Amino acid sequence: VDFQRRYKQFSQILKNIGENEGGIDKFSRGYESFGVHRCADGGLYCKEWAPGAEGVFLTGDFNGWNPFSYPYKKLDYGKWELYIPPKQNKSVLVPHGSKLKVVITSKSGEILYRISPWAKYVVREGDNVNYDWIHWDPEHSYEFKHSRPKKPRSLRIYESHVGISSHEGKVASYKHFTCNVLPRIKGLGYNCIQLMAIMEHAYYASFGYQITSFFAASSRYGSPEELQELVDTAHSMGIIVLLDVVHSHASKNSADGLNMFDGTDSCYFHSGPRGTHDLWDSRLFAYSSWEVLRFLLSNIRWWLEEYRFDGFRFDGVTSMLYHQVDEDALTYLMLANHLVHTLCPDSITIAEDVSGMPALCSPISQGGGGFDYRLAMAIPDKWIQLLKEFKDEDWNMGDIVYTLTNREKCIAYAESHDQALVGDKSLAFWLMDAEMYTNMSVLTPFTPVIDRGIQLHKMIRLITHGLGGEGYLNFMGNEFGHPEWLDFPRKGNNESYHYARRQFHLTDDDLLRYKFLNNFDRDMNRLEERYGWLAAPQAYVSEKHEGNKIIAFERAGLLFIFNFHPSKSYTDYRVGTALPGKFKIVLDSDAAEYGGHQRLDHSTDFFSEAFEHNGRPYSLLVYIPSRVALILQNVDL
Numbered sequence: 001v002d003f004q005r006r007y008k009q010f011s012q013i014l015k016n017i018g019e020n021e022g023g024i025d026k027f028s029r030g031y032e033s034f035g036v037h038r039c040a041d042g043g044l045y046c047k048e049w050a051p052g053a054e055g056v057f058l059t060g061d062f063n064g065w066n067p068f069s070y071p072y073k074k075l076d077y078g079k080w081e082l083y084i085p086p087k088q089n090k091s092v093l094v095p096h097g098s099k100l101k102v103v104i105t106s107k108s109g110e111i112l113y114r115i116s117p118w119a120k121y122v123v124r125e126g127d128n129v130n131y132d133w134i135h136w137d138p139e140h141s142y143e144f145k146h147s148r149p150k151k152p153r154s155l156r157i158y159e160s161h162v163g164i165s166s167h168e169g170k171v172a173s174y175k176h177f178t179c180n181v182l183p184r185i186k187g188l189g190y191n192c193i194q195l196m197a198i199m200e201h202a203y204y205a206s207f208g209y210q211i212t213s214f215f216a217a218s219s220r221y222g223s224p225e226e227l228q229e230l231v232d233t234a235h236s237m238g239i240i241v242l243l244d245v246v247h248s249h250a251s252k253n254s255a256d257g258l259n260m261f262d263g264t265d266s267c268y269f270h271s272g273p274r275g276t277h278d279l280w281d282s283r284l285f286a287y288s289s290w291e292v293l294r295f296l297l298s299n300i301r302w303w304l305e306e307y308r309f310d311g312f313r314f315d316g317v318t319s320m321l322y323h324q325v326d327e328d329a330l331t332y333l334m335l336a337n338h339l340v341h342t343l344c345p346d347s348i349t350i351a352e353d354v355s356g357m358p359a360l361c362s363p364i365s366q367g368g369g370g371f372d373y374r375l376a377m378a379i380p381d382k383w384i385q386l387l388k389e390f391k392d393e394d395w396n397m398g399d400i401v402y403t404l405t406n407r408e409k410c411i412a413y414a415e416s417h418d419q420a421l422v423g424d425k426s427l428a429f430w431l432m433d434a435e436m437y438t439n440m441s442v443l444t445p446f447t448p449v450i451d452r453g454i455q456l457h458k459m460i461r462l463i464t465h466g467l468g469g470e471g472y473l474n475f476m477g478n479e480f481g482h483p484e485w486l487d488f489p490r491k492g493n494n495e496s497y498h499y500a501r502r503q504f505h506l507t508d509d510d511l512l513r514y515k516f517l518n519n520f521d522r523d524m525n526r527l528e529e530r531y532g533w534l535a536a537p538q539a540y541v542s543e544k545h546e547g548n549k550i551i552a553f554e555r556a557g558l559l560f561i562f563n564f565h566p567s568k569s570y571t572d573y574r575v576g577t578a579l580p581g582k583f584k585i586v587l588d589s590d591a592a593e594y595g596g597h598q599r600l601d602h603s604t605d606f607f608s609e610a611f612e613h614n615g616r617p618y619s620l621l622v623y624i625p626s627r628v629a630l631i632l633q634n635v636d637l
Contacts, residue, residue: 001325003359003367009327010334010364013293017335024339030298031215031306035118036100038137042086044093048102048116049291050262051078057103058082060135062094067103067111078291096137106263115213115256117268117295122200122212122256123219131202131212131256134219142225144308146235149191151346154534155373155471156525157242158190159417161197161207162221164486165476167505169497171204174226178233184504186237188479188518189525193234194313196244196417198227202253205488207417209315210282211246212257214299217307224307231308240310242348243303247296247332248316249282259283268292277319287320287328293335300336304343311340311348314371318355325357330369337370348372350411361408376410376469378403383414383460387430392566397544397551404467405538412469414461420475420486422499428481428517431456436483440513452566454513454595455627457481458520459562462589462629465524466533466560467553472525480507480518516595523594527587527631531556542576542614550624552614554578558586559632561624569625576616579634580608583620587631599625606632 014024021027036058037045050056056072063069072080084093094100104112115122121136165181166172185193197208200216208218217227234241250269254260261267268291269275269283277284286292303309314336320329333351340347351360351371362368382403386395404412415427429436431453439450465472477486483506487499507518528534536556543552549565552575561575577583583606590596606620613619624630 001358006327006330006334007364007367010331010338013331014335014338024297024335024342027294028297028301028339030294031118031302034298035116035120035215036094036135038092038094039083042090042093044082044084046072046082046084048072048080048118049078049295050080050104050267052107052262052264052267053080053104054107054109055103055105056080056082057105058084058100059103060094060100060133061098062100092137094135094137096135096139098135100133100135104261104263108263110263112260112263113255114261117214117258117261119213119216121219121224122216124202133256136224138223138225142228142232144228144232144235146232148308148310148346149235149238149240152191152240153532154528155192155348155411156190156528156534157192157194157411157471157473158185158188159194159196159473159475160185161476162195162218163197163204164500164502167501167503169501171220171500174222174230177221178226178230181504182230182234182237182239186239188522189529190474191239191529192310193239193241194244194473195241195309198243199246202251202256205490206251207488208244209246209280210251211249212251212253214250214258214295215302228307235308240348242311242313242350243307243309244315245300245303245312246315247285247299247336248314248320249277249280249284252281252283268295274323280319285329287326287332293332296332297335297339300339301343304340304347310346311350311372312336313350313352315352317351317353317360321353321355321357334364334370338364341370350375361410373409373411373471375473376412377416378406379412379464379468380415380419383427384419384425384430387427392564395549395564397546397549397564400463401467401541401544401551401553404464405541407469407538409470410468411471411473412464413473413475414464415475415478417475420477420482422485422487424485426478426482426485427457427460428453428478428483429485432481440483442511442513450513452627454481454516455589457517458589458594459564459627459629461521462524462587463551463560463562465528466555466631467539470534472528472534474521477502477504479521480514482506482514513595516593520589520594523587531558531633533558540578542616548573552576557634559583559630559634561622561630561632563624563626563628565626567626569623571623572621573624574613574619575622576612576614576619577608577634578616578618580610580618581634582607582637583632584635585630586633587629589629590625596628597625599623600628600630608634 058070072082102114115133122131163171200213202212350373360369361371364370489495506514533556539553539555541553551562592598
């Protein structure tokens with residue numbers, strides 16, 4: 001692991017981009033010439049990279065699917081270009097909405113039909129097996145009417161999927177998300193959206209990880225304009241939008257995928273077994289290839305310019321790095337990060353990497369990967385372990401604090417989207433199990449099982465929110481303890497959509513108890529917006545008492561007190577503080593609005609006296625019931 005070496009390889013390639021292309025700006029604008037483009041003179045210009053093709057042709061509805069009437073002209077470095085002259089009667093060559101295909105002829109004499117790697121729009125019609133390549137040339141392009149919101153001080157991320165964002169068992173639309181989902185997200189106090197499964201993927205049940213058309217916005221949810229309007233509308237509400245970028249692998253589809261484009265097992269990918277991911281059954285990019293760099297870097301630029309995303313989460317980074325480190329893959333990621341931050345410094349990149357490779361989320365100029373954040377993937381593991389293997393009496397407070405404070409900036413979250421899937425368990429299900437379906441009605445007994453579940457759900461989220469990282473993430477539904485599970489239509493359930501949805505209406509039902517968890521989430525994030533503890537320095541933990549099961553710490557001037565003891569409550573409990581004066585409760589999980597027992601009097605003045613305790617110069621006395629979390633603010637006398 002040589003940091004000087006990683007930077008030298010990066011600096012060298014970036015320098016070549018400047019001398020052989022026109023810099024990284026021009027280099028990443030390949031989408032302007034590659035693919036299919038109607039020119040201002042009425043003609044059509046086309047260009048593809050296909051080094052192993054014998055011939056390249058364009059065909060479709062516009063020429064009666066004549067396969068060879070439009071041959072590309074062969075260029076240097078495996079490229080092909082085509083210009084079709086304007087029609088004599090000055091009508092359009094390729095009408096909006098019509099079908100196209102690139103024809104590839106092999107040295108074997110085989111005739112292959114392909115969708116362009118640079119396609120904007122692909123549609124599956126009715127019950128067909130394969131996707132069609134639809135030429136996108138609308139009457140009116142969408143014009144963005146709102147500017148980027150100011151860079152947020154801290155990220156409070158709402159991880160989302162457009163298709164499952166309604167209560168119906170169908171693929172929900174971009175417009176539905178825009179009209180009905182966006183204002184819910186804003187009201188919860190989230191200032192950032194992590195948009196999954198946007199890059200086009202033929203297999204809906206892959207949850208967006210199986211890419212077929214890399215420049216195509218998934219047609220499932222609607223048209224490209226409807227996606228642009230979604231992002232634009234989000235900006236008007238003061239919310240930035242991040243895209244999940246999958247550049248780690250590609251679907252093996254060849255008819256409507258990137259695989260075997262030029263009839264070869266090594267075009268955008270590596271030749272042989274090295275270019276295949278056995279566990280995922282997918283193809284692997286040749287990041288060392290100059291044209292693969294152009295392709296992927298132009299893709300990043302594409303999502304920034306055309307759809308105005310505010311940044312990216314690069315999925316599957318761990319896979320990219322380890323076939324020994326893949327120095328070609330890391331050099332791309334550095335170039336990708338360099339690209340994003342050079343065009344806009346306020347843009348954000350997040351790395352999904354479980355390996356924890358050093359310096360990945362530190363600056364490139366220090367030999368780093370250049371990522372702004374990494375996911376704190378150790379945190380959900382900890383909550384699963386505790387809930388699976390340990391009775392409440394046996395929870396190690398010191399272990400909880402170590403996991404949450406162990407840190408490069410990370411995005412903290414309590415549970416993952418993987419945990420919302422079928423066969424797995426959510427936090428809500430770990431805590432309430434079968435009583436999830438019997439006692440979530442306010443007309444039923446408030447059993448000790450439901451009570452314990454509701455309280456720990458709030459506490460687990462809050463301590464993760466306040467202690468765990470420099471950013472927070474929440475997967476759609478979990479903010480109110482969404483019941484049941486998530487599943488996509490597939491073979492294993494006979495193409496069922498019954499669990500491919502989200503029951504947002506559960507929070508609106510006054511007769512159900514999901515509103516309690518939802519209310520807590522909204523006030524938690526609104527509190528962070530006021531005090532900004534996520535951007536504050538790392539907390540000072542004054543107490544992790546194993547016997548009393550109390551965790552106490554200070555961050556951003558606020559005082560956090562957690563009582564994880566399953567039965568004991570404390571009436572004159574001493575907690576150390578940094579500041580003298582009067583303290584007031586600013587958040588209490590025992591409030592009636594959160595599904596608590598309303599035991600605390602919020603009008604109570606807490607006074608800090610000069611009395612050393614737990615390494616703090618001052619201390620106060622508090623009443624903290626079993627399974628209750630408290631946040632206190634120092635006010636003025």
